Amino acid sequence: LAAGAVILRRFAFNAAEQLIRDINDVASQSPFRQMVTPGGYTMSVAMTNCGHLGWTTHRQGYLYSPIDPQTNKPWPAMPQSFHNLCQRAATAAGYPDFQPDACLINRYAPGAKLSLHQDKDEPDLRAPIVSVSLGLPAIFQFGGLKRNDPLKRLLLEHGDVVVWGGESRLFYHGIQPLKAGFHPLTIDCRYNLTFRQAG
Ligand SMILES: [Fe+2]
């Protein structure tokens, strides 16, 4: 249970193949890189973006930038398949006016994790985040408004779409070490797209 969250399991199953082709297309211009946190530690989750803006780490913290700091080129345009799926997901959730300008693509290798954090770099925290999972299953862990609040678990599998709105939007969250295994479309990893209204 998560207030404001609309869980649409296997919603992106049909679009999955095209999404993976489009991730590889995005990755050819802006490669997956394990971003260095402000404290000097490399993240285990490999990331990249597409859209006008893109999430990245820098010296003084976290920010959205229209430029990829590794390639020094802008982030690739958001694929049509990405726009179409996010629009369908958002509309089904009660947000037909949601128009993302940023999509953070997370790649999880076996054992890759993401510790507890909040997504608060966006200007309007009332605007939801559309999460699309592809490939190997992962355990999404979440608390509440505070970091010491009781942790709940949710498995996110291939094609699972969640629209994190309302209270759920501000929840402290993370991903547990990705269990090893096989998936027909991604081989040995998990991909996660998080559409954001960043401008
Ligand atoms: Fe997050």
Side-chain angles (χ1 to χ4, degrees):
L1 201 99
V6 176
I7 307 111
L8 298 171
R9 291 171 182 90
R10 303 201 193 298
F11 192 81
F13 187 77
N14 294 153
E17 283 215 53
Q18 189 51 64
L19 257 22
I20 290 155
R21 284 182 185 114
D22 283 325
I23 286 165
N24 291 321
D25 202 274
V26 167
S28 69
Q29 189 187 324
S30 272
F32 274 107
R33 85 295 307 262
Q34 288 173 253
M35 294 178 182
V36 178
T37 211
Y41 294 83
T42 309
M43 295 172 82
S44 63
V45 185
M47 291 167 163
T48 192
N49 300 260
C50 65
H52 297 94
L53 294 177
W55 190 88
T56 189
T57 59
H58 87 126
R59 295 175 293 263
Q60 299 284 284
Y62 307 126
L63 54 67
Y64 279 101
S65 178
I67 302 302
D68 178 342
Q70 183 176 288
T71 63
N72 305 114
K73 282 192 284 187
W75 300 106
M78 201 184 284
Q80 205 64 65
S81 69
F82 272 46
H83 267 128
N84 292 347
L85 179 71
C86 183
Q87 202 73 260
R88 286 195 291 122
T91 300
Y95 300 96
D97 302 311
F98 185 69
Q99 276 173 82
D101 50 10
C103 183
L104 179 59
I105 313 175
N106 288 191
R107 184 180 68 196
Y108 298 82
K113 50 180 173 185
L114 203 48
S115 60
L116 298 177
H117 66 283
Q118 283 178 305
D119 275 76
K120 54 183 185 182
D121 302 304
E122 303 73 35
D124 193 359
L125 306 172
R126 294 176 293 198
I129 284 182
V130 178
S131 173
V132 184
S133 293
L134 300 166
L136 288 182
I139 304 165
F140 185 92
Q141 52 171 223
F142 59 106
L145 59 154
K146 294 181 183 183
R147 207 166 181 153
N148 283 59
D149 274 31
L151 292 162
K152 294 177 179 182
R153 297 178 304 265
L154 256 175
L155 195 78
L156 295 180
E157 304 189 284
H158 183 243
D160 291 1
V161 176
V162 195
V163 180
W164 302 104
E167 199 173 46
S168 73
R169 176 66 184 79
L170 281 308
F171 279 175
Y172 266 93
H173 59 287
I175 297 289
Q176 290 191 359
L178 189 87
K179 186 179 176 177
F182 182 76
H183 192 278
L185 305 179
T186 63
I187 301 299
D188 55 7
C189 69
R190 173 185 179 245
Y191 291 116
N192 184 266
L193 320 176
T194 42
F195 296 85
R196 302 114 188 282
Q197 224 161 57

mmCIF file with all atom_site columns, all heavy atoms in Angstrom, residues 20-33 48-50 68 70-71 76 105 107 191:
data_model
loop_
_atom_site.group_PDB
_atom_site.id
_atom_site.type_symbol
_atom_site.label_atom_id
_atom_site.label_alt_id
_atom_site.label_comp_id
_atom_site.label_asym_id
_atom_site.label_entity_id
_atom_site.label_seq_id
_atom_site.pdbx_PDB_ins_code
_atom_site.Cartn_x
_atom_site.Cartn_y
_atom_site.Cartn_z
_atom_site.occupancy
_atom_site.B_iso_or_equiv
_atom_site.pdbx_formal_charge
_atom_site.auth_seq_id
_atom_site.auth_comp_id
_atom_site.auth_asym_id
_atom_site.auth_atom_id
_atom_site.pdbx_PDB_model_num
ATOM 1   N N   . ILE A 1 20  ? 13.298 -1.452 -25.606 1.00 0.00 ? 20  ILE A N   1
ATOM 2   C CA  . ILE A 1 20  ? 14.662 -1.972 -25.472 1.00 0.00 ? 20  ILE A CA  1
ATOM 3   C C   . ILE A 1 20  ? 15.532 -1.577 -26.682 1.00 0.00 ? 20  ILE A C   1
ATOM 4   O O   . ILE A 1 20  ? 16.700 -1.217 -26.504 1.00 0.00 ? 20  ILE A O   1
ATOM 5   C CB  . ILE A 1 20  ? 14.640 -3.499 -25.163 1.00 0.00 ? 20  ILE A CB  1
ATOM 6   C CG1 . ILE A 1 20  ? 14.105 -3.683 -23.737 1.00 0.00 ? 20  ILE A CG1 1
ATOM 7   C CG2 . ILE A 1 20  ? 16.051 -4.132 -25.258 1.00 0.00 ? 20  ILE A CG2 1
ATOM 8   C CD1 . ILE A 1 20  ? 13.473 -5.018 -23.448 1.00 0.00 ? 20  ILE A CD1 1
ATOM 9   N N   . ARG A 1 21  ? 14.931 -1.555 -27.878 1.00 0.00 ? 21  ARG A N   1
ATOM 10  C CA  . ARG A 1 21  ? 15.609 -1.138 -29.120 1.00 0.00 ? 21  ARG A CA  1
ATOM 11  C C   . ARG A 1 21  ? 15.947 0.349  -29.005 1.00 0.00 ? 21  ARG A C   1
ATOM 12  O O   . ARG A 1 21  ? 17.022 0.793  -29.416 1.00 0.00 ? 21  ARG A O   1
ATOM 13  C CB  . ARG A 1 21  ? 14.694 -1.308 -30.338 1.00 0.00 ? 21  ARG A CB  1
ATOM 14  C CG  . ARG A 1 21  ? 14.498 -2.718 -30.843 1.00 0.00 ? 21  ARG A CG  1
ATOM 15  C CD  . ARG A 1 21  ? 13.606 -2.710 -32.082 1.00 0.00 ? 21  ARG A CD  1
ATOM 16  N NE  . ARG A 1 21  ? 13.291 -4.062 -32.542 1.00 0.00 ? 21  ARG A NE  1
ATOM 17  C CZ  . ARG A 1 21  ? 12.076 -4.609 -32.533 1.00 0.00 ? 21  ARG A CZ  1
ATOM 18  N NH1 . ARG A 1 21  ? 11.024 -3.929 -32.087 1.00 0.00 ? 21  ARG A NH1 1
ATOM 19  N NH2 . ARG A 1 21  ? 11.917 -5.857 -32.956 1.00 0.00 ? 21  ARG A NH2 1
ATOM 20  N N   . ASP A 1 22  ? 15.006 1.097  -28.427 1.00 0.00 ? 22  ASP A N   1
ATOM 21  C CA  . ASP A 1 22  ? 15.140 2.532  -28.223 1.00 0.00 ? 22  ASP A CA  1
ATOM 22  C C   . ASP A 1 22  ? 16.097 2.924  -27.099 1.00 0.00 ? 22  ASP A C   1
ATOM 23  O O   . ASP A 1 22  ? 16.669 4.010  -27.141 1.00 0.00 ? 22  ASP A O   1
ATOM 24  C CB  . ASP A 1 22  ? 13.770 3.185  -28.069 1.00 0.00 ? 22  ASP A CB  1
ATOM 25  C CG  . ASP A 1 22  ? 13.050 3.339  -29.404 1.00 0.00 ? 22  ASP A CG  1
ATOM 26  O OD1 . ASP A 1 22  ? 13.724 3.594  -30.429 1.00 0.00 ? 22  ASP A OD1 1
ATOM 27  O OD2 . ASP A 1 22  ? 11.813 3.213  -29.431 1.00 0.00 ? 22  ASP A OD2 1
ATOM 28  N N   . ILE A 1 23  ? 16.294 2.025  -26.128 1.00 0.00 ? 23  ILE A N   1
ATOM 29  C CA  . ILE A 1 23  ? 17.248 2.231  -25.031 1.00 0.00 ? 23  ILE A CA  1
ATOM 30  C C   . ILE A 1 23  ? 18.650 2.097  -25.647 1.00 0.00 ? 23  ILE A C   1
ATOM 31  O O   . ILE A 1 23  ? 19.506 2.943  -25.413 1.00 0.00 ? 23  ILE A O   1
ATOM 32  C CB  . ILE A 1 23  ? 17.062 1.194  -23.861 1.00 0.00 ? 23  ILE A CB  1
ATOM 33  C CG1 . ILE A 1 23  ? 15.808 1.540  -23.057 1.00 0.00 ? 23  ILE A CG1 1
ATOM 34  C CG2 . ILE A 1 23  ? 18.275 1.200  -22.900 1.00 0.00 ? 23  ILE A CG2 1
ATOM 35  C CD1 . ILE A 1 23  ? 15.328 0.441  -22.143 1.00 0.00 ? 23  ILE A CD1 1
ATOM 36  N N   . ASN A 1 24  ? 18.838 1.076  -26.488 1.00 0.00 ? 24  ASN A N   1
ATOM 37  C CA  . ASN A 1 24  ? 20.120 0.835  -27.168 1.00 0.00 ? 24  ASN A CA  1
ATOM 38  C C   . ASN A 1 24  ? 20.486 1.977  -28.126 1.00 0.00 ? 24  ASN A C   1
ATOM 39  O O   . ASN A 1 24  ? 21.662 2.308  -28.279 1.00 0.00 ? 24  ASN A O   1
ATOM 40  C CB  . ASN A 1 24  ? 20.104 -0.508 -27.906 1.00 0.00 ? 24  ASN A CB  1
ATOM 41  C CG  . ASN A 1 24  ? 20.075 -1.701 -26.955 1.00 0.00 ? 24  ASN A CG  1
ATOM 42  O OD1 . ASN A 1 24  ? 20.734 -1.699 -25.910 1.00 0.00 ? 24  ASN A OD1 1
ATOM 43  N ND2 . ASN A 1 24  ? 19.307 -2.725 -27.315 1.00 0.00 ? 24  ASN A ND2 1
ATOM 44  N N   . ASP A 1 25  ? 19.456 2.615  -28.689 1.00 0.00 ? 25  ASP A N   1
ATOM 45  C CA  . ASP A 1 25  ? 19.574 3.758  -29.609 1.00 0.00 ? 25  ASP A CA  1
ATOM 46  C C   . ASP A 1 25  ? 20.025 4.994  -28.811 1.00 0.00 ? 25  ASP A C   1
ATOM 47  O O   . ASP A 1 25  ? 20.909 5.738  -29.252 1.00 0.00 ? 25  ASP A O   1
ATOM 48  C CB  . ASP A 1 25  ? 18.214 4.027  -30.271 1.00 0.00 ? 25  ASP A CB  1
ATOM 49  C CG  . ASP A 1 25  ? 18.324 4.787  -31.582 1.00 0.00 ? 25  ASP A CG  1
ATOM 50  O OD1 . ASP A 1 25  ? 18.377 6.037  -31.558 1.00 0.00 ? 25  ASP A OD1 1
ATOM 51  O OD2 . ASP A 1 25  ? 18.328 4.128  -32.643 1.00 0.00 ? 25  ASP A OD2 1
ATOM 52  N N   . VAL A 1 26  ? 19.425 5.183  -27.630 1.00 0.00 ? 26  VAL A N   1
ATOM 53  C CA  . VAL A 1 26  ? 19.760 6.292  -26.726 1.00 0.00 ? 26  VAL A CA  1
ATOM 54  C C   . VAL A 1 26  ? 21.193 6.104  -26.214 1.00 0.00 ? 26  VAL A C   1
ATOM 55  O O   . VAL A 1 26  ? 21.992 7.045  -26.238 1.00 0.00 ? 26  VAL A O   1
ATOM 56  C CB  . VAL A 1 26  ? 18.757 6.374  -25.516 1.00 0.00 ? 26  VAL A CB  1
ATOM 57  C CG1 . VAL A 1 26  ? 19.266 7.309  -24.402 1.00 0.00 ? 26  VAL A CG1 1
ATOM 58  C CG2 . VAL A 1 26  ? 17.395 6.860  -26.001 1.00 0.00 ? 26  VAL A CG2 1
ATOM 59  N N   . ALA A 1 27  ? 21.509 4.861  -25.839 1.00 0.00 ? 27  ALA A N   1
ATOM 60  C CA  . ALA A 1 27  ? 22.820 4.463  -25.314 1.00 0.00 ? 27  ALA A CA  1
ATOM 61  C C   . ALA A 1 27  ? 23.989 4.624  -26.288 1.00 0.00 ? 27  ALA A C   1
ATOM 62  O O   . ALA A 1 27  ? 25.130 4.769  -25.858 1.00 0.00 ? 27  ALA A O   1
ATOM 63  C CB  . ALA A 1 27  ? 22.765 3.032  -24.784 1.00 0.00 ? 27  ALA A CB  1
ATOM 64  N N   . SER A 1 28  ? 23.697 4.633  -27.589 1.00 0.00 ? 28  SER A N   1
ATOM 65  C CA  . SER A 1 28  ? 24.730 4.794  -28.615 1.00 0.00 ? 28  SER A CA  1
ATOM 66  C C   . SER A 1 28  ? 25.209 6.252  -28.728 1.00 0.00 ? 28  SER A C   1
ATOM 67  O O   . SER A 1 28  ? 26.337 6.500  -29.158 1.00 0.00 ? 28  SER A O   1
ATOM 68  C CB  . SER A 1 28  ? 24.259 4.245  -29.972 1.00 0.00 ? 28  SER A CB  1
ATOM 69  O OG  . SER A 1 28  ? 23.230 5.030  -30.543 1.00 0.00 ? 28  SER A OG  1
ATOM 70  N N   . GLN A 1 29  ? 24.355 7.197  -28.313 1.00 0.00 ? 29  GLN A N   1
ATOM 71  C CA  . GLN A 1 29  ? 24.686 8.634  -28.322 1.00 0.00 ? 29  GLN A CA  1
ATOM 72  C C   . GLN A 1 29  ? 25.138 9.069  -26.916 1.00 0.00 ? 29  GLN A C   1
ATOM 73  O O   . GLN A 1 29  ? 26.110 9.814  -26.777 1.00 0.00 ? 29  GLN A O   1
ATOM 74  C CB  . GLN A 1 29  ? 23.493 9.481  -28.803 1.00 0.00 ? 29  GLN A CB  1
ATOM 75  C CG  . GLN A 1 29  ? 23.805 10.983 -29.048 1.00 0.00 ? 29  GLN A CG  1
ATOM 76  C CD  . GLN A 1 29  ? 22.567 11.835 -29.351 1.00 0.00 ? 29  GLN A CD  1
ATOM 77  O OE1 . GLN A 1 29  ? 21.623 11.383 -30.008 1.00 0.00 ? 29  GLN A OE1 1
ATOM 78  N NE2 . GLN A 1 29  ? 22.571 13.076 -28.867 1.00 0.00 ? 29  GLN A NE2 1
ATOM 79  N N   . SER A 1 30  ? 24.411 8.625  -25.888 1.00 0.00 ? 30  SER A N   1
ATOM 80  C CA  . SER A 1 30  ? 24.733 8.922  -24.492 1.00 0.00 ? 30  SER A CA  1
ATOM 81  C C   . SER A 1 30  ? 24.870 7.584  -23.785 1.00 0.00 ? 30  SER A C   1
ATOM 82  O O   . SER A 1 30  ? 23.861 7.010  -23.354 1.00 0.00 ? 30  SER A O   1
ATOM 83  C CB  . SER A 1 30  ? 23.626 9.727  -23.811 1.00 0.00 ? 30  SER A CB  1
ATOM 84  O OG  . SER A 1 30  ? 23.792 11.116 -23.983 1.00 0.00 ? 30  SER A OG  1
ATOM 85  N N   . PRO A 1 31  ? 26.115 7.060  -23.656 1.00 0.00 ? 31  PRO A N   1
ATOM 86  C CA  . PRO A 1 31  ? 26.358 5.771  -22.998 1.00 0.00 ? 31  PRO A CA  1
ATOM 87  C C   . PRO A 1 31  ? 25.976 5.678  -21.539 1.00 0.00 ? 31  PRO A C   1
ATOM 88  O O   . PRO A 1 31  ? 25.900 6.687  -20.831 1.00 0.00 ? 31  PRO A O   1
ATOM 89  C CB  . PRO A 1 31  ? 27.872 5.582  -23.150 1.00 0.00 ? 31  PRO A CB  1
ATOM 90  C CG  . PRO A 1 31  ? 28.177 6.303  -24.399 1.00 0.00 ? 31  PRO A CG  1
ATOM 91  C CD  . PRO A 1 31  ? 27.379 7.573  -24.214 1.00 0.00 ? 31  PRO A CD  1
ATOM 92  N N   . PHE A 1 32  ? 25.731 4.441  -21.110 1.00 0.00 ? 32  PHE A N   1
ATOM 93  C CA  . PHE A 1 32  ? 25.425 4.152  -19.723 1.00 0.00 ? 32  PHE A CA  1
ATOM 94  C C   . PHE A 1 32  ? 26.727 4.366  -18.970 1.00 0.00 ? 32  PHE A C   1
ATOM 95  O O   . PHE A 1 32  ? 27.799 3.969  -19.442 1.00 0.00 ? 32  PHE A O   1
ATOM 96  C CB  . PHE A 1 32  ? 24.973 2.704  -19.546 1.00 0.00 ? 32  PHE A CB  1
ATOM 97  C CG  . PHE A 1 32  ? 23.510 2.490  -19.775 1.00 0.00 ? 32  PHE A CG  1
ATOM 98  C CD1 . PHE A 1 32  ? 23.056 1.832  -20.933 1.00 0.00 ? 32  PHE A CD1 1
ATOM 99  C CD2 . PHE A 1 32  ? 22.567 2.954  -18.838 1.00 0.00 ? 32  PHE A CD2 1
ATOM 100 C CE1 . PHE A 1 32  ? 21.672 1.636  -21.166 1.00 0.00 ? 32  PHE A CE1 1
ATOM 101 C CE2 . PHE A 1 32  ? 21.178 2.770  -19.049 1.00 0.00 ? 32  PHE A CE2 1
ATOM 102 C CZ  . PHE A 1 32  ? 20.729 2.109  -20.214 1.00 0.00 ? 32  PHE A CZ  1
ATOM 103 N N   . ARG A 1 33  ? 26.641 5.129  -17.888 1.00 0.00 ? 33  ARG A N   1
ATOM 104 C CA  . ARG A 1 33  ? 27.805 5.390  -17.061 1.00 0.00 ? 33  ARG A CA  1
ATOM 105 C C   . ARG A 1 33  ? 27.407 5.302  -15.604 1.00 0.00 ? 33  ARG A C   1
ATOM 106 O O   . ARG A 1 33  ? 26.278 5.631  -15.221 1.00 0.00 ? 33  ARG A O   1
ATOM 107 C CB  . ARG A 1 33  ? 28.465 6.754  -17.397 1.00 0.00 ? 33  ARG A CB  1
ATOM 108 C CG  . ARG A 1 33  ? 27.908 8.044  -16.733 1.00 0.00 ? 33  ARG A CG  1
ATOM 109 C CD  . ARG A 1 33  ? 26.474 8.397  -17.156 1.00 0.00 ? 33  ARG A CD  1
ATOM 110 N NE  . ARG A 1 33  ? 26.324 8.445  -18.604 1.00 0.00 ? 33  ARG A NE  1
ATOM 111 C CZ  . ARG A 1 33  ? 26.364 9.559  -19.326 1.00 0.00 ? 33  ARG A CZ  1
ATOM 112 N NH1 . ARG A 1 33  ? 26.538 10.737 -18.733 1.00 0.00 ? 33  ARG A NH1 1
ATOM 113 N NH2 . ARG A 1 33  ? 26.288 9.482  -20.647 1.00 0.00 ? 33  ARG A NH2 1
ATOM 114 N N   . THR A 1 48  ? 21.807 6.922  -17.706 1.00 0.00 ? 48  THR A N   1
ATOM 115 C CA  . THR A 1 48  ? 21.803 7.789  -18.879 1.00 0.00 ? 48  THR A CA  1
ATOM 116 C C   . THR A 1 48  ? 20.410 8.413  -18.943 1.00 0.00 ? 48  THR A C   1
ATOM 117 O O   . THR A 1 48  ? 19.547 8.083  -18.121 1.00 0.00 ? 48  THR A O   1
ATOM 118 C CB  . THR A 1 48  ? 22.178 7.086  -20.227 1.00 0.00 ? 48  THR A CB  1
ATOM 119 O OG1 . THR A 1 48  ? 22.409 8.101  -21.210 1.00 0.00 ? 48  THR A OG1 1
ATOM 120 C CG2 . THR A 1 48  ? 21.076 6.127  -20.731 1.00 0.00 ? 48  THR A CG2 1
ATOM 121 N N   . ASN A 1 49  ? 20.222 9.364  -19.860 1.00 0.00 ? 49  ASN A N   1
ATOM 122 C CA  . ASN A 1 49  ? 18.931 10.033 -20.030 1.00 0.00 ? 49  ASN A CA  1
ATOM 123 C C   . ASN A 1 49  ? 18.607 10.320 -21.485 1.00 0.00 ? 49  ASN A C   1
ATOM 124 O O   . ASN A 1 49  ? 19.467 10.249 -22.364 1.00 0.00 ? 49  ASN A O   1
ATOM 125 C CB  . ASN A 1 49  ? 18.892 11.406 -19.340 1.00 0.00 ? 49  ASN A CB  1
ATOM 126 C CG  . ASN A 1 49  ? 19.114 11.350 -17.862 1.00 0.00 ? 49  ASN A CG  1
ATOM 127 O OD1 . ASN A 1 49  ? 18.162 11.396 -17.091 1.00 0.00 ? 49  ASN A OD1 1
ATOM 128 N ND2 . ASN A 1 49  ? 20.378 11.365 -17.447 1.00 0.00 ? 49  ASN A ND2 1
ATOM 129 N N   . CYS A 1 50  ? 17.346 10.692 -21.693 1.00 0.00 ? 50  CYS A N   1
ATOM 130 C CA  . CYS A 1 50  ? 16.814 11.116 -22.977 1.00 0.00 ? 50  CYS A CA  1
ATOM 131 C C   . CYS A 1 50  ? 15.733 12.143 -22.653 1.00 0.00 ? 50  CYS A C   1
ATOM 132 O O   . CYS A 1 50  ? 15.100 12.081 -21.590 1.00 0.00 ? 50  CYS A O   1
ATOM 133 C CB  . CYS A 1 50  ? 16.292 9.956  -23.835 1.00 0.00 ? 50  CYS A CB  1
ATOM 134 S SG  . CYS A 1 50  ? 14.872 9.035  -23.232 1.00 0.00 ? 50  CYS A SG  1
ATOM 135 N N   . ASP A 1 68  ? 24.801 16.399 -21.519 1.00 0.00 ? 68  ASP A N   1
ATOM 136 C CA  . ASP A 1 68  ? 25.369 15.170 -20.959 1.00 0.00 ? 68  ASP A CA  1
ATOM 137 C C   . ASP A 1 68  ? 26.808 15.555 -20.594 1.00 0.00 ? 68  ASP A C   1
ATOM 138 O O   . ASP A 1 68  ? 27.593 15.848 -21.482 1.00 0.00 ? 68  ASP A O   1
ATOM 139 C CB  . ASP A 1 68  ? 25.330 14.060 -22.031 1.00 0.00 ? 68  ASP A CB  1
ATOM 140 C CG  . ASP A 1 68  ? 25.940 12.718 -21.569 1.00 0.00 ? 68  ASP A CG  1
ATOM 141 O OD1 . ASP A 1 68  ? 26.695 12.648 -20.576 1.00 0.00 ? 68  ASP A OD1 1
ATOM 142 O OD2 . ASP A 1 68  ? 25.668 11.710 -22.243 1.00 0.00 ? 68  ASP A OD2 1
ATOM 143 N N   . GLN A 1 70  ? 29.357 13.804 -19.779 1.00 0.00 ? 70  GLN A N   1
ATOM 144 C CA  . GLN A 1 70  ? 30.384 12.870 -20.250 1.00 0.00 ? 70  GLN A CA  1
ATOM 145 C C   . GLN A 1 70  ? 30.697 13.109 -21.726 1.00 0.00 ? 70  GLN A C   1
ATOM 146 O O   . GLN A 1 70  ? 31.860 13.251 -22.104 1.00 0.00 ? 70  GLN A O   1
ATOM 147 C CB  . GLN A 1 70  ? 29.966 11.411 -20.022 1.00 0.00 ? 70  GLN A CB  1
ATOM 148 C CG  . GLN A 1 70  ? 31.040 10.404 -20.446 1.00 0.00 ? 70  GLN A CG  1
ATOM 149 C CD  . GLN A 1 70  ? 30.681 8.983  -20.129 1.00 0.00 ? 70  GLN A CD  1
ATOM 150 O OE1 . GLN A 1 70  ? 30.691 8.584  -18.967 1.00 0.00 ? 70  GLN A OE1 1
ATOM 151 N NE2 . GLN A 1 70  ? 30.404 8.191  -21.160 1.00 0.00 ? 70  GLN A NE2 1
ATOM 152 N N   . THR A 1 71  ? 29.656 13.153 -22.548 1.00 0.00 ? 71  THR A N   1
ATOM 153 C CA  . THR A 1 71  ? 29.818 13.364 -23.988 1.00 0.00 ? 71  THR A CA  1
ATOM 154 C C   . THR A 1 71  ? 29.923 14.845 -24.366 1.00 0.00 ? 71  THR A C   1
ATOM 155 O O   . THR A 1 71  ? 30.409 15.180 -25.447 1.00 0.00 ? 71  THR A O   1
ATOM 156 C CB  . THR A 1 71  ? 28.635 12.764 -24.768 1.00 0.00 ? 71  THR A CB  1
ATOM 157 O OG1 . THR A 1 71  ? 27.424 13.434 -24.391 1.00 0.00 ? 71  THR A OG1 1
ATOM 158 C CG2 . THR A 1 71  ? 28.506 11.279 -24.491 1.00 0.00 ? 71  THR A CG2 1
ATOM 159 N N   . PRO A 1 76  ? 19.988 12.498 -25.819 1.00 0.00 ? 76  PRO A N   1
ATOM 160 C CA  . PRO A 1 76  ? 19.204 12.154 -27.014 1.00 0.00 ? 76  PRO A CA  1
ATOM 161 C C   . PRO A 1 76  ? 17.753 12.567 -26.839 1.00 0.00 ? 76  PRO A C   1
ATOM 162 O O   . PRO A 1 76  ? 17.300 12.775 -25.709 1.00 0.00 ? 76  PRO A O   1
ATOM 163 C CB  . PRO A 1 76  ? 19.301 10.627 -27.061 1.00 0.00 ? 76  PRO A CB  1
ATOM 164 C CG  . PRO A 1 76  ? 20.593 10.351 -26.435 1.00 0.00 ? 76  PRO A CG  1
ATOM 165 C CD  . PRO A 1 76  ? 20.615 11.283 -25.270 1.00 0.00 ? 76  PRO A CD  1
ATOM 166 N N   . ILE A 1 105 ? 17.204 6.738  -17.365 1.00 0.00 ? 105 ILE A N   1
ATOM 167 C CA  . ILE A 1 105 ? 17.278 5.308  -17.649 1.00 0.00 ? 105 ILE A CA  1
ATOM 168 C C   . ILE A 1 105 ? 18.334 4.659  -16.760 1.00 0.00 ? 105 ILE A C   1
ATOM 169 O O   . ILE A 1 105 ? 19.527 4.943  -16.877 1.00 0.00 ? 105 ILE A O   1
ATOM 170 C CB  . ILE A 1 105 ? 17.602 5.007  -19.152 1.00 0.00 ? 105 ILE A CB  1
ATOM 171 C CG1 . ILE A 1 105 ? 16.712 5.856  -20.079 1.00 0.00 ? 105 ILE A CG1 1
ATOM 172 C CG2 . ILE A 1 105 ? 17.392 3.501  -19.440 1.00 0.00 ? 105 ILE A CG2 1
ATOM 173 C CD1 . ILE A 1 105 ? 17.025 5.726  -21.570 1.00 0.00 ? 105 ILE A CD1 1
ATOM 174 N N   . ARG A 1 107 ? 20.220 1.177  -15.458 1.00 0.00 ? 107 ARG A N   1
ATOM 175 C CA  . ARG A 1 107 ? 20.567 -0.195 -15.851 1.00 0.00 ? 107 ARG A CA  1
ATOM 176 C C   . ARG A 1 107 ? 21.108 -0.890 -14.605 1.00 0.00 ? 107 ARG A C   1
ATOM 177 O O   . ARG A 1 107 ? 22.050 -0.402 -13.973 1.00 0.00 ? 107 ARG A O   1
ATOM 178 C CB  . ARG A 1 107 ? 21.619 -0.252 -16.964 1.00 0.00 ? 107 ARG A CB  1
ATOM 179 C CG  . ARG A 1 107 ? 21.930 -1.690 -17.450 1.00 0.00 ? 107 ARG A CG  1
ATOM 180 C CD  . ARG A 1 107 ? 22.975 -1.729 -18.549 1.00 0.00 ? 107 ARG A CD  1
ATOM 181 N NE  . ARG A 1 107 ? 24.299 -1.343 -18.058 1.00 0.00 ? 107 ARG A NE  1
ATOM 182 C CZ  . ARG A 1 107 ? 25.328 -0.999 -18.832 1.00 0.00 ? 107 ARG A CZ  1
ATOM 183 N NH1 . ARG A 1 107 ? 25.206 -0.981 -20.156 1.00 0.00 ? 107 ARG A NH1 1
ATOM 184 N NH2 . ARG A 1 107 ? 26.481 -0.654 -18.271 1.00 0.00 ? 107 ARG A NH2 1
ATOM 185 N N   . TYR A 1 191 ? 16.200 -2.788 -16.727 1.00 0.00 ? 191 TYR A N   1
ATOM 186 C CA  . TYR A 1 191 ? 16.173 -1.396 -17.139 1.00 0.00 ? 191 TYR A CA  1
ATOM 187 C C   . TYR A 1 191 ? 14.983 -0.745 -16.452 1.00 0.00 ? 191 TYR A C   1
ATOM 188 O O   . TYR A 1 191 ? 13.964 -1.397 -16.208 1.00 0.00 ? 191 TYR A O   1
ATOM 189 C CB  . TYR A 1 191 ? 16.001 -1.252 -18.653 1.00 0.00 ? 191 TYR A CB  1
ATOM 190 C CG  . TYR A 1 191 ? 17.179 -1.700 -19.489 1.00 0.00 ? 191 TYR A CG  1
ATOM 191 C CD1 . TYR A 1 191 ? 17.057 -2.781 -20.383 1.00 0.00 ? 191 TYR A CD1 1
ATOM 192 C CD2 . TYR A 1 191 ? 18.422 -1.037 -19.409 1.00 0.00 ? 191 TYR A CD2 1
ATOM 193 C CE1 . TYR A 1 191 ? 18.162 -3.202 -21.190 1.00 0.00 ? 191 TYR A CE1 1
ATOM 194 C CE2 . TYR A 1 191 ? 19.524 -1.442 -20.207 1.00 0.00 ? 191 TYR A CE2 1
ATOM 195 C CZ  . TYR A 1 191 ? 19.392 -2.525 -21.089 1.00 0.00 ? 191 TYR A CZ  1
ATOM 196 O OH  . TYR A 1 191 ? 20.483 -2.931 -21.831 1.00 0.00 ? 191 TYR A OH  1
#
